[PDB]
Amino acid sequence: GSFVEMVDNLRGKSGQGYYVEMTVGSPPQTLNILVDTGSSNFAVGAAPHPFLHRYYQRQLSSTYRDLRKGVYVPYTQGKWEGELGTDLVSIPHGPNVTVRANIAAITESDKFFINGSNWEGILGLAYAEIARPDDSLEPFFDSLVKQTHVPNLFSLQLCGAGFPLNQSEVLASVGGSMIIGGIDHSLYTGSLWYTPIRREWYYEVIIVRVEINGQDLKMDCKEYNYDKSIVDSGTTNLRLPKKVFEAAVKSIKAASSTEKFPDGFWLGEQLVCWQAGTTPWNIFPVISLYLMGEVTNQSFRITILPQQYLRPVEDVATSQDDCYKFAISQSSTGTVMGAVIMEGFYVVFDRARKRIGFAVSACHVHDEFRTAAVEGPFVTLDMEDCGYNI
Numbered sequence: 001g002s003f004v005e006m007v008d009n010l011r012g013k014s015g016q017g018y019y020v021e022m023t024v025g026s027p028p029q030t031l032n033i034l035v036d037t038g039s040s041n042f043a044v045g046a047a048p049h050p051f052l053h054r055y056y057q058r059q060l061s062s063t064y065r066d067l068r069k070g071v072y073v074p075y076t077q078g079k080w081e082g083e084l085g086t087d088l089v090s091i092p093h094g095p096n097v098t099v100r101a102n103i104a105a106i107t108e109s110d111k112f113f114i115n116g117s118n119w120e121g122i123l124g125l126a127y128a129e130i131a132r133p134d135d136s137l138e139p140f141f142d143s144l145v146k147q148t149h150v151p152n153l154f155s156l157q158l159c160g161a162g163f164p165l166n167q168s169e170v171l172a173s174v175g176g177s178m179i180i181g182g183i184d185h186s187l188y189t190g191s192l193w194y195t196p197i198r199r200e201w202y203y204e205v206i207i208v209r210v211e212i213n214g215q216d217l218k219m220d221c222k223e224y225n226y227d228k229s230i231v232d233s234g235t236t237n238l239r240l241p242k243k244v245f246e247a248a249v250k251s252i253k254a255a256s257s258t259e260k261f262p263d264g265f266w267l268g269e270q271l272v273c274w275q276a277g278t279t280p281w282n283i284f285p286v287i288s289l290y291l292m293g294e295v296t297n298q299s300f301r302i303t304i305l306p307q308q309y310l311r312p313v314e315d316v317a318t319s320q321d322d323c324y325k326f327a328i329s330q331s332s333t334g335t336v337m338g339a340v341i342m343e344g345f346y347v348v349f350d351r352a353r354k355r356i357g358f359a360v361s362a363c364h365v366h367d368e369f370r371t372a373a374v375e376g377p378f379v380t381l382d383m384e385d386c387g388y389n390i
């Protein structure tokens, strides 16, 4: 491990997000910021809200610069709106640099802030193409690389606890690491395998084959990337395109058929509970996603366990049972490799080399019989045909 200052600088969990401490303004104003590889704006609460115990106060920052422009960000299940500006930004448990970055000061929002999440803003780490209002608003990471000698790469180790964390425990627990400008070898075991970044907007990748307990899902590979496949720390679940979700759920049900679960469980709505310590991990299958490799006609696979795709939740009766929600759900916007998938792996966002690296995480949850895996190579043909085009 060569980046000790950044190791263990994250807190949080899959369902509420993983956040890093940042400071904005002069004198510095400390805020907790959601690490989001699925968006490209640095946006912070800048007005009182019921779910925020602190927010950015532009009038107290001597370095605040008003861009005199509003930003409106409506999304599926909500929105945020604010005012654009710039200020001096630092990451205390990060590179020892201060940069001038764009900041969207959030003045109004609907279903954006989460009660008890402990974060007050979001760090959009994806590319300018998807920045709001448009690609002229330089994302934070682009500013950081342009203004300093920080290498154009970051890596994420998101650590799921494997069990529920109460309010006090989640504040006192280490949620993982965001290594800015490098790869820390203490965070993974085995080898790093790289997949190309198909296009620089979201962190888009190409899935070439899917297995459930070694059994090929046998769908046309274009289905797996319809209309795109992305790596997103800002999404909780592994999200699959409708048809892929339907085929995967049927195969996961068939593999776990020794126990019957209600439809509400498979819909990701209701929890399932087992007596403390008796979760039947072994009846649930492993899921392998094969990704396009860096060499022609070569792929590799990442394999996750039910310990990643069953999300620990506290029972409604706060009982001594071990309870979970199924953390795989359908999408109408392509595949999303969310936090529950990222929790299995150390993920390297190698922007400099337009590639994403995967290695087994040193903090993934497993049992004495199975572990997550990153393996290769495999001979795979016509992988370019797996990508979707509108």
Ligand SMILES: CN1C(=N)N[C@](c2ccccc2)(c2cccc(-c3cccnc3)c2)C1=O
Pocket: 014, 015, 016, 017, 018, 034, 036, 037, 038, 039, 073, 075, 112, 113, 122, 232, 233, 234, 235, 236
């Ligand atoms: C899918 N996704 C995402 N990757 N970031 C969010 C977003 C970002 C910018 C603009 C609109 C939406 C987002 C926003 C707020 C909270 C979360 C969020 C919620 C729960 C667990 N982890 C993260 C995600 C979002 O909806």
